[PDB]
Amino acid sequence: SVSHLEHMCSLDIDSQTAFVRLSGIICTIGPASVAPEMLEKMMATGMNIARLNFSHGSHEYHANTIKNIREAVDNYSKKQGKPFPLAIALDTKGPEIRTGLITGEVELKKGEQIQLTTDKDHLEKGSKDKIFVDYVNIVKVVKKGDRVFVDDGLISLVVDSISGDTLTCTVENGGLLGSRKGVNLPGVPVDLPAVSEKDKSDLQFGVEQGVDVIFASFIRNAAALKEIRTILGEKGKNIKIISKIENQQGMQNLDAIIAASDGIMVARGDLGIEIPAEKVFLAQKSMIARCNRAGKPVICATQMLESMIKKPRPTRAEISDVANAIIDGADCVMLSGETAKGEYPLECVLTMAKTCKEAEAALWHRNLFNDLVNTTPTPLDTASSIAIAASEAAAKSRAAAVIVITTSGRSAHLISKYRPRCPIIAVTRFAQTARQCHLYRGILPVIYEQQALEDWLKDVDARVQYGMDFGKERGFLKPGNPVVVVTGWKQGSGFTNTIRIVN
Amino acid sequence: NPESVSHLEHMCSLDIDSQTAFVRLSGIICTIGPASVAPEMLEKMMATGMNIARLNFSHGSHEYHANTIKNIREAVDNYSKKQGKPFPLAIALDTKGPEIRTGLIEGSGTGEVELKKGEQIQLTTDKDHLEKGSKDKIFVDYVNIVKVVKKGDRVFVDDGLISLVVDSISGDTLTCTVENGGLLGSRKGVNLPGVPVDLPAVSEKDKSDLQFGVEQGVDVIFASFIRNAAALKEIRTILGEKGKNIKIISKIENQQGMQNLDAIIAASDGIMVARGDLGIEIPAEKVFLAQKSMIARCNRAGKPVICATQMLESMIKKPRPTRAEISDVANAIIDGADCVMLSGETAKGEYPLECVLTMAKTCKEAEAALWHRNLFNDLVNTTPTPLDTASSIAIAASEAAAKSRAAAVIVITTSGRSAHLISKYRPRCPIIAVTRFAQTARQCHLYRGILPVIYEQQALEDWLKDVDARVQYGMDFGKERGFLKPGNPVVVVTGWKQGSGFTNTIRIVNVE
Amino acid sequence: SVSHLEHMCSLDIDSQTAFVRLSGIICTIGPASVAPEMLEKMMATGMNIARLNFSHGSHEYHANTIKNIREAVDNYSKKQGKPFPLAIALDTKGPEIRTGLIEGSGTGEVELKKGEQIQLTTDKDHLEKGSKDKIFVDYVNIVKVVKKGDRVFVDDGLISLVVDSISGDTLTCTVENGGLLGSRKGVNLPGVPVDLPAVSEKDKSDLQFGVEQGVDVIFASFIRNAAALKEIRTILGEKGKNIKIISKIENQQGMQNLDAIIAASDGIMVARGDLGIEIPAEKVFLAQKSMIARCNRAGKPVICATQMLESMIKKPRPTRAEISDVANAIIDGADCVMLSGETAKGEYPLECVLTMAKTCKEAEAALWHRNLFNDLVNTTPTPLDTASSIAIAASEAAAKSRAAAVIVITTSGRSAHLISKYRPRCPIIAVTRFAQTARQCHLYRGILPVIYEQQALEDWLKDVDARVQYGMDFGKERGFLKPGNPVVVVTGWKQGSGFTNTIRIVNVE
Amino acid sequence: SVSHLEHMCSLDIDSQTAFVRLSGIICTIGPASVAPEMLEKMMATGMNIARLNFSHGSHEYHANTIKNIREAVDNYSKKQGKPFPLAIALDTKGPEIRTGLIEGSGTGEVELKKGEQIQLTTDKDHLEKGSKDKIFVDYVNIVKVVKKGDRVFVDDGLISLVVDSISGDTLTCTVENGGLLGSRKGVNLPGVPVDLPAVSEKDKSDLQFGVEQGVDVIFASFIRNAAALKEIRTILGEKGKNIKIISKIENQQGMQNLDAIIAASDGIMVARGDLGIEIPAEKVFLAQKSMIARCNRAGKPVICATQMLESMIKKPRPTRAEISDVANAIIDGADCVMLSGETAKGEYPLECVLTMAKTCKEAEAALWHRNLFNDLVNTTPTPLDTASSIAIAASEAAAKSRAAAVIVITTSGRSAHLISKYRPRCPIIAVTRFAQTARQCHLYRGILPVIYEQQALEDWLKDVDARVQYGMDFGKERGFLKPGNPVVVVTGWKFTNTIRIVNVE
């Protein structure tokens, strides 16, 4: 197509898409999905990485969930030999602010005045007149204006006055107020530590469990990630951290976060409460875009398929939301209550995979590729040059797939950055790298445990031919199709500087 | 350092802090039902931003809809307390269309029977299925099912919940096996995807409904299951001399309408993408493709396009919508959709006012997000030939408003077409369309950016004095509503002769 | 066309060009063209503005040339009955450096060969005795400006020297590149920032003479540090305030601060003659393609000059290289093209003007209007004033409707200039009461000036309609348009002088 | 550098270009350049291929020129261990129409006046006494091809006549523009498509002579259709099958069905000399900017020729218009530039080659690489052969990494031609064992041919690595690169299909 309008006009529902689905699917684990058999069915449906929500549950619960997911993935991983890698996600509880106790059932009427206090002797004595708040130095931040939310945005207050520990407020439309409810201070820069005590214990637990990825909540500044890396320490150094942008402060210096982060999640749930809801899409379409420029994964999450929790079929709005999320350039999509609490998890994962395939085919590869080429590269490192040239070759020759041999995974990450249509079959000896590769669009990880040959020359060829066999088994390619092969020289670090087209 | 070289750089440049303009260009369509039928609630919806009301004739009698029309007319006249300026509001008729339905389940036991996979079900001439219906027998009203269905084709029942595949074909009966089985209910629709049905676009009930709408003086009709252009020829002939001015909007609900979309869009006054039936017809995963195609083609043709069905569903039960619904409406308008529509949200839903309000807000934001320069260049480049003398005026006025960052463009029009041409090119500023004719101003709401203003003052003998008076009236409207203030530039388009399709003139004018 | 390469592939010799020729042709007047009858013939051929080179000739000579040009425009004015405007341009001698005189003995021009030494002495008492051992400068003490490693040129770049040693009054140099040195030849210093006065005494007298004669345009030579144009405006004074000044970029300094000059100037000429001597000749095209381009951004006229059709001085037909040069000059975006020795001294001036008009028409037709228009639209930033918005919208309307022409009603001429910036294919028929504005309108590409003598109508609306109809009549007589064609008309809202803001599409009767 | 206008605005004369000069320079050989010393100096100055015009001179003269060029290329090889490759080109006389002898005596040139009458006759018995009354031509089938108001030219397009009437054997004509008629003058019929055979008897003997001499390329004049090249290939036969043919587009018929010619030909030269006579001269640039462009789309070399630097024949310095012409010719996308009278008859051949190289470097640097590359990417079909995909990927990698050079190993030369099609800024060092392929590589922009004399090693990878390392050594000798610079190396199996980025050792 010549123009974007002509491209949109050229969309044909009759035009069939390719079988391969490049974008990863993230599923939150809960009572509905914790069972091993249900987990195997979800895994066969297309779940690439399972997400554990640490905002609730004990270490024993999540450890048992990890044990169940491991037994299920090993039982499914009985094809080929010891393949099928699957990534582990942590997601921290994060720095939240909570209300006190009145059980509750208090009612707050519009127009009346209530007082949110940090005095501890009101923790249990909460009522409609006065209320305790977890945040200690909320008075240090917050101005004479600034709206306040309680309970997922259901209740709203406006700060009228500020005293030592009172903050007299007026109710900007109110409902039923409970106990230990949400916070969300829109606009204000929160000073709370990025990693709290529970987050510290949870990160150490994740290091012990051997988790692949952490989703860090309320990532505001770049010092946060230094703290997270130093707390994960020497043992967890390989584990990748994905920052969650939930408030205005993280959004404001987003570029610094993306530079410091391994990836970003647009948590539309808390963000929609923080910033005006009507703007949320702007944010994601900004955020995703910037991520695609930086080469870091971006995840669209929260409330994508909500209605499927109760009902077997989704709404048109939800299919449109997921399709627009992947068309924006999102590396991965996420399910929260759909898989954890929902009654119809398999249908959720299935419809997500199918709609991802369709919107994935809908992309305008030539213009998007051209834009990603000029968006940032300079004289270029030389490593990215190999990736961009291989992507261009795969696009021009209409290759069935690209086979990438990598130790760290970086070469496959750059190739995924440049967005080829064909799958990226990344062959690696390291299990953890292959598992965490699912965070990037288009990377099909293949784990090669088979011994190495004395000479590196024939061993790399054996690994590439194993990738060929994988491609035919899955159905990516057949005899006579061309593919791109990227290798290097010497068995060391990032040296992927060979490109080949082979039929 | 510009306003984005590439589309990716444009998306990167979106800033939540950058405030949008007060004006909201895209129209909001609301379906009327028991929750919204009351006149007071209708006035509240109108004040919230409802531009056109939609009446679903698939249910209810003529007397009910006549009472609804009476209430909407009384309400729109009651709203006319803005300075004493009668506010125009459009009324739309959505046809029942040629549908195929099953009968009722017995009240015996639980409401709905369950149908499981592998079982038997007889398609017969069961006439007493309105109260004795069950799991054994099913009757259909489609006479010509035989010539139309093939072997491997699939059949759906009840909103896609149950799916069957036709095994064998006899004289009056189809034999099927249950592919996907669920809870068979009462009075459910039967839609077959792949296959094109030969049913007439306008049935007898549709004929009576269209004549009733013409008599009532409805502004627009939404025609369901529009397959070919002969449908629209028939609709024009049935509307006759009286309804000739009423605009027909074709609804693309099945694969047959999708296949020959260009002929329909050429023959139609506008198109609605009714994703309700469409998601059942073509695979649901593909529906967005259709809309993103359909809307796009409409924007090329200069005809209105409506994104509809299930936009704000969650708000029926709960006061606030989900992120997915806001994303759907925002992407619908960013695709280029002129109007958005609410079905159960306003008609059946519990929170209609909140639905209309949140729709207006998210519409404003996604409206501001657009990339005007590239989209304008594309819309300019789609028509390579020498452009029509009227369309040249429209495109030049849009370019002038874009370059001078005009607060608004004032259009004086009798038929309404010139404002439609200006709306095609998607200007950021509002399009203040001045018209003496009430119905043209009312139906102008189908186009993005047109604020209709109705001019009741009689025709002055001197044509130049009259056109200047109407342009000054548009200025007064803009100042009262708050579109513009003193010192802002605006574009004024008039004509060269006193009549109809003779538009012309472009002028940049400040404010006093 | 989608792309530039595909556009170049799409050029078709079968594709007929438009009748109109938008780009102006500048002709230098000399012994071959000074005669009144020959001058009328040149005007009929298509000469839009006449150029007078003040580097030679007296005030009386140029006044007589102006008299001949006026009588020629007078007798041409009975072709179709209306007064044909033609602009007269004054090109200043400028601050140039020349050598002294050779001893009349031997051959006229002594030869200087590479590797030998020669002494520049500045001392004025060595005016006749110059030879291969000693050389002489014209004016200004360049030793305060020149360093040792610097290079020096003599005679149109033919001879090159490098300063070996510097003394008080003198200068010892070695010949790097050697040629044939004559007497009183030009001297160009490529590296040094020149200290010469922007306006000299003779230049002052010449500008005052041009003001008295009522010249339309001045071409100011050797505009280096942009501060000059203030001096030029102050010397033109109250009488010349309306006269437009075109800066000539001939050396490295003018190229270095080109943006300040173009902002301060009314237009720019790329004088490739002196420029090719100053900067390396191989680079000249870069300069022009930069300079013209920036002018197109600014909305200022730009002139490509010097040695475009040189061979036609001697022979009746040009070479392929010269036709390519003029075609590429106009395709670059140059508003006007100029002939120097071709018309002044050359034997075949009329053929030069003819071939210039033809090749201008062809390269004019070859342009890619859509992409260039989009580029010029995206060059303009903020919510532009209503006048620029009207000009850009009118250009877009003329392009979309394939208008036969655009009729502009203007007093000062600015509105037609803004329309000319955006490069419409159709002619820009600018109707004006003021003769001088119509005359100087030829500096802009695509403007056909029309002078309206009647006017003084009681009703202002009827007067503007009469002037637009007179523009229609001009278009029909010349053949721009016929009944049934649409055209764009831009007028104003109130009787003023720089208001515009009206656009209409009207068909011809 | 967002837009083309902004690109032209951003051009800086101070911004230094790379030392490499990609576009080839063609020089016509004549009395001024035939000497061995002049030929060696031209070769060192930058002469890439020498052109022989067979419209004049005998077989002995051209054989002496070829002997001198071979002696010159061997004698130049004073670069420490560098065997210098050089291409030789043959330009055919072609099917031309000429008059007989005048009666010129007494004064040098007779004067013929405008408005007189002239009778063009095909009767052969009017030949010796021609002067001004009746004129004979050698084209037999003029009557079947010429129409009424068609025009006729005499003397290089300087003089013009119009055919008034037509009889059986003769035509009566009227003088529109009048000059002096000489002897053996060219006659071109513009409007008409000429039916003459592309290869005449003399053309046959000349092409076989060129095959015997071992010429690299032939320039075929007045190429109208593809049957011309069918005849040329059959005349080259088994021995000349490898020789590449460049078609000269001089008339309207070749322009009309240009696509078939460009597809069937190995390359095209836009001979602006005869073309300016055929089509209106004012239009010629259009043609070239089309022709060159289409060649760049097809991937075949295109040459802009004739009258580029004419003034340098008489004067030591060129005009601004001529420098602009050559710069615009290369900026259009012309693979090679050519000199006719500048080097053959002119007094200053070396100076012509010098200024040509300098202006070529400058206009080469001025190019907008990204947009031209993107256009060349989108012009090529959807599924593409693996070789062109390798070439486009190598060009994109060289552009992104700002490689110092690209090393290409090829036997036939095509892969390097595909890489040259996409126009990389860095030089394309093409290593080949066969001399003639290296010679004919000069027709393509950016290819520096390198001839590798070392014999076939038994191990394949060691042989390919030795050839690439010799290319590295060549780059260091010329001064293209230093340690730490990246370069592109394209190799393969057996058919090229390997592309790698390697830095400098």
Coordinates of all heavy atoms in Angstrom, one line a residue, chain C residues 3 8-9 11 272-273 282-283 285 289-290 294 297 307 317 320-321 324-325 328 358 362-363 375, chain D residues 3 5 8-9 11 13 158 177 272-273 283 285 289-290 297 307 319-321 324-325 328 362-363 375:
Chain C
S3 N 6.9 8.3 -5.7 CA 8.2 8.6 -5.3 C 8.9 9.4 -6.3 O 8.5 9.6 -7.4 CB 9.0 7.3 -5.0 OG 8.5 6.5 -4.0
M8 N 10.6 10.6 -11.9 CA 11.5 10.8 -13.0 C 11.3 9.8 -14.1 O 11.5 10.1 -15.3 CB 13.0 10.8 -12.5 CG 13.4 12.0 -11.8 SD 15.2 12.0 -11.5 CE 15.4 13.7 -10.8
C9 N 11.0 8.6 -13.8 CA 10.7 7.6 -14.8 C 9.4 8.0 -15.6 O 9.3 7.6 -16.8 CB 10.4 6.2 -14.2 SG 11.9 5.4 -13.4
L11 N 8.4 10.9 -16.7 CA 8.5 12.0 -17.7 C 8.2 11.5 -19.1 O 8.8 10.5 -19.5 CB 9.8 12.6 -17.6 CG 10.0 13.8 -16.5 CD1 9.8 13.3 -15.1 CD2 11.5 14.3 -16.6
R272 N 27.5 32.7 -10.3 CA 28.4 31.6 -10.3 C 29.8 32.0 -11.0 O 30.7 31.3 -10.8 CB 27.8 30.4 -11.1 CG 26.5 29.9 -10.5 CD 26.0 28.6 -11.2 NE 25.7 28.8 -12.6 CZ 25.0 27.9 -13.4 NH1 24.6 26.8 -12.8 NH2 24.8 28.2 -14.7
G273 N 29.8 33.1 -11.7 CA 31.1 33.6 -12.3 C 32.1 33.8 -11.2 O 33.2 33.2 -11.3
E282 N 34.2 23.1 -8.7 CA 33.5 21.8 -8.6 C 32.4 21.9 -7.6 O 31.4 21.1 -7.7 CB 34.5 20.7 -8.3 CG 35.7 20.6 -9.2 CD 36.8 21.6 -8.8 OE1 36.9 21.9 -7.6 OE2 37.6 21.9 -9.7
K283 N 32.5 22.8 -6.6 CA 31.5 22.9 -5.5 C 30.3 23.8 -5.9 O 29.3 23.8 -5.2 CB 32.2 23.4 -4.3 CG 33.2 22.5 -3.6 CD 33.9 23.2 -2.5 CE 34.9 22.3 -1.8 NZ 34.3 21.1 -1.2
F285 N 27.7 24.0 -7.8 CA 26.4 23.5 -7.8 C 25.8 23.3 -6.4 O 24.7 23.8 -6.1 CB 26.3 22.2 -8.6 CG 26.9 21.0 -7.9 CD1 26.1 20.1 -7.2 CD2 28.3 20.8 -7.9 CE1 26.6 19.0 -6.6 CE2 28.8 19.7 -7.2 CZ 28.0 18.8 -6.6
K289 N 22.3 24.9 -5.3 CA 21.2 24.1 -4.9 C 20.9 24.4 -3.4 O 19.7 24.2 -3.0 CB 21.6 22.6 -5.1 CG 21.5 22.2 -6.6 CD 21.7 20.8 -6.8 CE 21.4 20.4 -8.3 NZ 21.1 19.0 -8.5
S290 N 21.9 24.8 -2.6 CA 21.5 25.3 -1.3 C 20.8 26.6 -1.4 O 19.6 26.7 -0.9 CB 22.8 25.4 -0.4 OG 23.4 24.2 -0.3
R294 N 17.0 27.6 -0.1 CA 16.7 28.4 1.1 C 15.8 29.6 0.6 O 14.9 29.9 1.3 CB 18.0 28.9 1.8 CG 18.8 27.8 2.4 CD 19.9 28.3 3.2 NE 20.7 27.3 3.8 CZ 21.6 27.4 4.7 NH1 21.9 28.6 5.2 NH2 22.3 26.4 5.2
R297 N 12.4 28.5 0.5 CA 11.9 28.4 1.8 C 11.4 29.8 2.3 O 10.4 30.0 2.8 CB 12.9 27.9 2.8 CG 12.4 27.9 4.2 CD 13.5 27.8 5.3 NE 14.1 26.5 5.4 CZ 15.3 26.2 4.9 NH1 16.1 27.1 4.4 NH2 15.8 24.9 5.0
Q307 N 27.2 32.4 -17.4 CA 27.7 31.3 -18.3 C 26.7 30.1 -18.5 O 27.1 29.0 -18.6 CB 29.0 30.7 -17.7 CG 30.1 31.7 -17.6 CD 31.4 31.0 -17.2 OE1 31.8 30.0 -17.8 NE2 32.1 31.6 -16.2
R317 N 23.2 27.7 -32.0 CA 22.6 26.7 -31.1 C 23.4 26.3 -29.9 O 24.6 26.3 -30.0 CB 22.2 25.5 -32.0 CG 21.2 25.8 -33.1 CD 21.1 24.8 -34.2 NE 20.0 25.0 -35.0 CZ 19.9 26.0 -35.9 NH1 20.9 26.9 -36.1 NH2 18.8 26.1 -36.6
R320 N 24.3 20.5 -25.3 CA 23.4 19.8 -24.5 C 23.7 20.1 -23.0 O 22.8 20.2 -22.2 CB 23.7 18.3 -24.7 CG 23.5 17.8 -26.1 CD 22.2 18.3 -26.7 NE 22.2 17.9 -28.2 CZ 22.1 18.8 -29.1 NH1 22.1 20.1 -28.9 NH2 22.0 18.4 -30.4
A321 N 25.0 20.4 -22.7 CA 25.3 20.8 -21.3 C 24.6 22.1 -20.9 O 24.2 22.2 -19.7 CB 26.8 20.9 -21.1
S324 N 20.9 21.5 -20.3 CA 20.8 20.8 -19.1 C 21.0 21.7 -17.9 O 20.3 21.6 -16.9 CB 21.8 19.6 -19.0 OG 21.4 18.6 -19.9
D325 N 22.0 22.7 -18.0 CA 22.3 23.6 -16.9 C 21.1 24.5 -16.6 O 20.7 24.6 -15.5 CB 23.5 24.4 -17.2 CG 23.7 25.5 -16.2 OD1 23.8 25.2 -15.0 OD2 23.8 26.7 -16.6
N328 N 18.2 22.3 -15.2 CA 18.4 22.0 -13.8 C 18.3 23.2 -12.9 O 17.9 23.1 -11.7 CB 19.7 21.3 -13.7 CG 19.7 19.8 -14.2 OD1 19.0 19.0 -13.6 ND2 20.3 19.5 -15.3
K358 N 11.9 28.3 -24.2 CA 11.5 26.9 -24.5 C 11.9 25.9 -23.4 O 11.1 25.1 -22.9 CB 12.0 26.4 -25.9 CG 11.0 26.7 -27.1 CD 11.0 28.2 -27.5 CE 10.2 28.4 -28.7 NZ 10.1 29.8 -29.1
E362 N 9.8 23.6 -20.7 CA 9.9 22.1 -20.5 C 10.2 21.7 -19.1 O 9.5 20.9 -18.5 CB 10.9 21.6 -21.5 CG 10.5 21.8 -23.0 CD 9.4 20.9 -23.4 OE1 9.0 20.0 -22.6 OE2 8.9 21.0 -24.5
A363 N 11.3 22.3 -18.5 CA 11.7 22.0 -17.1 C 10.6 22.4 -16.1 O 10.5 21.8 -15.1 CB 13.0 22.6 -16.8
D375 N 6.0 20.0 0.8 CA 7.3 20.4 1.4 C 7.2 21.9 1.8 O 7.6 22.3 3.0 CB 8.4 20.2 0.4 CG 9.8 20.0 1.1 OD1 10.1 20.7 2.1 OD2 10.6 19.2 0.6
Chain D
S3 N 13.0 16.3 4.6 CA 12.4 16.5 3.3 C 13.5 16.8 2.2 O 14.6 17.1 2.6 CB 11.3 17.6 3.2 OG 10.3 17.3 4.1
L5 N 13.6 19.3 0.1 CA 13.9 20.7 0.1 C 14.9 20.9 1.3 O 15.9 21.7 1.1 CB 12.6 21.5 0.3 CG 12.7 23.1 0.4 CD1 13.1 23.7 -0.9 CD2 11.4 23.6 0.9
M8 N 18.3 19.8 0.2 CA 19.0 20.7 -0.6 C 19.5 21.9 0.2 O 20.6 22.5 0.0 CB 18.2 21.2 -1.7 CG 18.1 20.2 -2.9 SD 17.2 20.8 -4.3 CE 17.4 19.5 -5.5
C9 N 18.7 22.4 1.2 CA 19.1 23.5 2.1 C 20.2 23.1 2.9 O 21.1 24.0 3.2 CB 17.9 23.9 2.9 SG 16.5 24.7 2.1
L11 N 22.8 21.3 2.3 CA 24.1 21.1 1.6 C 25.1 22.1 2.0 O 24.9 23.3 2.0 CB 23.8 21.1 0.1 CG 23.3 19.8 -0.6 CD1 23.1 20.0 -2.1 CD2 24.3 18.7 -0.3
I13 N 29.2 23.2 1.4 CA 30.5 23.0 0.7 C 31.6 22.7 1.6 O 32.6 22.0 1.2 CB 30.7 24.3 -0.1 CG1 30.9 25.5 0.8 CG2 29.7 24.5 -1.2 CD1 32.3 25.9 1.2
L158 N 22.4 21.6 -37.3 CA 22.5 23.0 -37.5 C 21.6 23.6 -38.5 O 21.1 24.7 -38.4 CB 24.0 23.4 -37.7 CG 24.9 23.0 -36.6 CD1 26.4 23.5 -36.9 CD2 24.5 23.6 -35.3
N177 N 15.1 26.7 -42.8 CA 16.3 27.3 -42.3 C 17.4 26.9 -43.1 O 17.6 25.7 -43.4 CB 16.5 26.9 -40.8 CG 17.3 27.9 -40.0 OD1 18.4 27.5 -39.5 ND2 16.8 29.1 -39.9
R272 N 23.1 12.2 -26.2 CA 22.4 13.5 -26.3 C 22.7 14.2 -27.6 O 21.9 15.1 -28.1 CB 22.7 14.4 -25.1 CG 22.3 13.8 -23.8 CD 22.5 14.8 -22.7 NE 23.8 15.2 -22.5 CZ 24.2 15.9 -21.4 NH1 23.4 16.1 -20.4 NH2 25.5 16.2 -21.2
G273 N 23.8 13.9 -28.3 CA 24.2 14.6 -29.5 C 23.2 14.3 -30.6 O 22.5 15.3 -31.1
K283 N 13.7 19.3 -25.0 CA 13.2 18.1 -24.3 C 14.2 17.1 -23.8 O 13.9 16.2 -23.1 CB 12.1 17.4 -25.2 CG 10.9 18.2 -25.4 CD 10.0 17.5 -26.4 CE 8.7 18.3 -26.7 NZ 7.9 18.5 -25.5
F285 N 16.7 16.8 -21.8 CA 16.9 16.5 -20.4 C 15.8 15.5 -19.9 O 16.1 14.5 -19.2 CB 17.0 17.8 -19.6 CG 15.7 18.5 -19.4 CD1 15.0 18.3 -18.3 CD2 15.2 19.3 -20.4 CE1 13.8 19.0 -18.1 CE2 14.0 19.9 -20.3 CZ 13.3 19.8 -19.1
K289 N 16.6 12.1 -17.9 CA 16.2 11.9 -16.5 C 15.2 10.8 -16.4 O 15.1 10.1 -15.4 CB 15.6 13.2 -16.0 CG 16.7 14.2 -15.6 CD 16.1 15.5 -14.9 CE 17.3 16.3 -14.5 NZ 16.9 17.3 -13.4
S290 N 14.4 10.5 -17.5 CA 13.6 9.3 -17.6 C 14.6 8.1 -17.8 O 14.6 7.2 -16.9 CB 12.6 9.4 -18.7 OG 11.7 10.4 -18.5
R297 N 16.2 1.7 -12.0 CA 15.2 0.7 -11.6 C 15.5 -0.7 -12.1 O 15.4 -1.7 -11.4 CB 13.8 1.2 -12.2 CG 12.7 0.2 -11.9 CD 11.5 0.5 -12.8 NE 10.8 1.7 -12.4 CZ 9.9 2.3 -13.2 NH1 9.6 1.9 -14.4 NH2 9.4 3.5 -12.7
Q307 N 29.1 16.3 -25.3 CA 29.1 17.8 -25.1 C 29.0 18.1 -23.6 O 28.4 19.2 -23.3 CB 27.9 18.4 -25.9 CG 28.1 18.3 -27.4 CD 27.0 19.1 -28.1 OE1 25.9 19.4 -27.7 NE2 27.4 19.6 -29.3
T319 N 33.2 25.8 -18.1 CA 32.2 26.8 -17.8 C 31.3 26.2 -16.6 O 31.4 25.1 -16.3 CB 31.2 27.1 -18.9 OG1 30.5 25.9 -19.3 CG2 32.0 27.6 -20.1
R320 N 30.6 27.2 -15.9 CA 29.7 26.7 -14.8 C 28.6 25.8 -15.3 O 28.3 24.9 -14.6 CB 29.1 28.0 -14.2 CG 30.2 29.0 -13.7 CD 31.3 28.4 -12.9 NE 32.3 29.4 -12.6 CZ 33.5 29.4 -13.0 NH1 33.9 28.3 -13.7 NH2 34.4 30.3 -12.6
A321 N 28.1 26.1 -16.5 CA 27.1 25.2 -17.1 C 27.5 23.8 -17.3 O 26.7 22.9 -17.1 CB 26.6 25.8 -18.4
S324 N 27.8 22.1 -13.9 CA 26.4 21.8 -13.5 C 25.9 20.6 -14.3 O 25.1 19.8 -13.7 CB 25.6 23.0 -13.6 OG 25.9 24.0 -12.7
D325 N 26.1 20.5 -15.6 CA 25.6 19.4 -16.4 C 26.1 18.1 -15.9 O 25.4 17.1 -15.7 CB 25.9 19.6 -17.8 CG 25.6 18.4 -18.7 OD1 24.4 18.0 -18.7 OD2 26.5 17.8 -19.3
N328 N 24.7 17.3 -12.4 CA 23.3 16.9 -12.5 C 23.1 15.6 -13.1 O 22.2 14.8 -12.8 CB 22.5 18.0 -13.2 CG 22.2 19.2 -12.3 OD1 21.5 19.1 -11.3 ND2 22.8 20.3 -12.7
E362 N 32.1 15.5 -5.7 CA 31.2 16.4 -5.0 C 29.7 16.0 -5.2 O 29.0 15.9 -4.2 CB 31.4 17.8 -5.5 CG 32.8 18.4 -5.2 CD 33.0 18.7 -3.7 OE1 32.0 18.6 -2.9 OE2 34.1 19.0 -3.3
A363 N 29.3 15.8 -6.4 CA 27.9 15.4 -6.6 C 27.6 14.1 -6.0 O 26.4 13.8 -5.7 CB 27.6 15.5 -8.1
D375 N 13.3 4.0 -2.4 CA 12.7 3.9 -3.7 C 13.1 2.7 -4.4 O 12.3 1.9 -5.0 CB 12.9 5.2 -4.6 CG 12.3 6.4 -4.0 OD1 11.5 6.3 -3.0 OD2 12.6 7.5 -4.5

